[PDB]
Amino acid sequence: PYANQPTVRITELTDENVKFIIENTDLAVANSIRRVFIAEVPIIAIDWVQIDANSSVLHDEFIAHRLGLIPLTSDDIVDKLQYSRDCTCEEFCPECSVEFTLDVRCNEDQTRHVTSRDLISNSPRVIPVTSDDILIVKLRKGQELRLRAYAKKGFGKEHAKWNPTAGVAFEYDPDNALRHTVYPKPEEWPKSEYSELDEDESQAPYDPNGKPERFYYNVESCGSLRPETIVLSALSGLKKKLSDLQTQLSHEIQ
């Protein structure tokens, strides 16, 4: 009638992705954890682009949309930052945003590459993660792009710019022991990387008493957060959501 005792085993940990395994857990908790990786980990991404001068070939909304998609280093600052909608200011103070300034004038004849290197932050902790650098726009001789933009805290549910994951691989039952999927010709299907069968079987023998468990994860970060930070913030956020729901439920019952 109570919680499982989930066990973690990290198989790989690089600076761009983390691969791990969770045993002793139901399918719903693992799926919600993957869902929270994708759509509920807050990061800092550019929003509120104000363009002072844009004589480039790409129109203004194009440049703003490209700026929004640039990932920003938000490893340790995002937790103490506040949502701008909740802050008490003109919506941009240092406690709820990070200012960015771009001012590029192409004077030489050669094609000028406006990259993420040209984004100057007012806070050193928050920079573009590439600082090759992400190309924003190419400028001709005589063209200019000059703007100031901010970066607010948000999560992937609101807009995909705030999604920190570059693809979250999730798997369970690599040998199809539970037969949650029914191969018409199981011999034709390649073995998963976590499969434990020999090269004469195609599926594990069917287990009627089986239950989903030993969920394999591979969380690849776009760069704005370290992958371990993504997972820790994900679990913290889901716990926070459940605690807030418990608070509201208690208030409703009383």
Partner: protein, 115 residues
């Protein structure tokens, strides 16, 4: 044009209750929890944890419409145990589970980094 704002899928507007309880008159000891501005994230996990309880005779959830943001969770229980008690116990179990998972994930990170 008619596109809804992106923020109104997790934000409660003024005078909107996060969660509302209504007794189901069709069956004794059955309740419906309508939680606004939520999705399958809480619905599926709460449903699974409620199914783990032995005293819960029924536990299910549905989103009435994907474009809208509500989850209706129906919980029926044995006569000696209320649905509200089961719901609270399920959420506390999930919170304990995720706290333990956080601690063990931190320990695993420290071992992998040291190793």
């Amino acid at each position: 044009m008619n596109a809804p704002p992106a923020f109104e899928s997790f934000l409660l507007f003024e005078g909107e209750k996060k969660i509302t309880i209504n007794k189901d008159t069709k069956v004794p000891n059955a309740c419906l929890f309508t939680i606004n501005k939520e999705d399958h994230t809480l619905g599926n996990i709460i449903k699974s944890q409620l199914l783990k309880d032995p005293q819960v005779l029924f536990a299910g959830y549905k989103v009435p419409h994907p474009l809208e943001h509500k989850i209706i969770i129906r919980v029926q229980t044995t006569p000696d145990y209320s649905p509200q008690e089961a719901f609270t116990n399920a959420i506390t179990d999930l919170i304990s589970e995720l706290s333990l998972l956080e601690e063990r994930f931190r320990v695993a990170i420290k071992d992998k980094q040291e190793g």
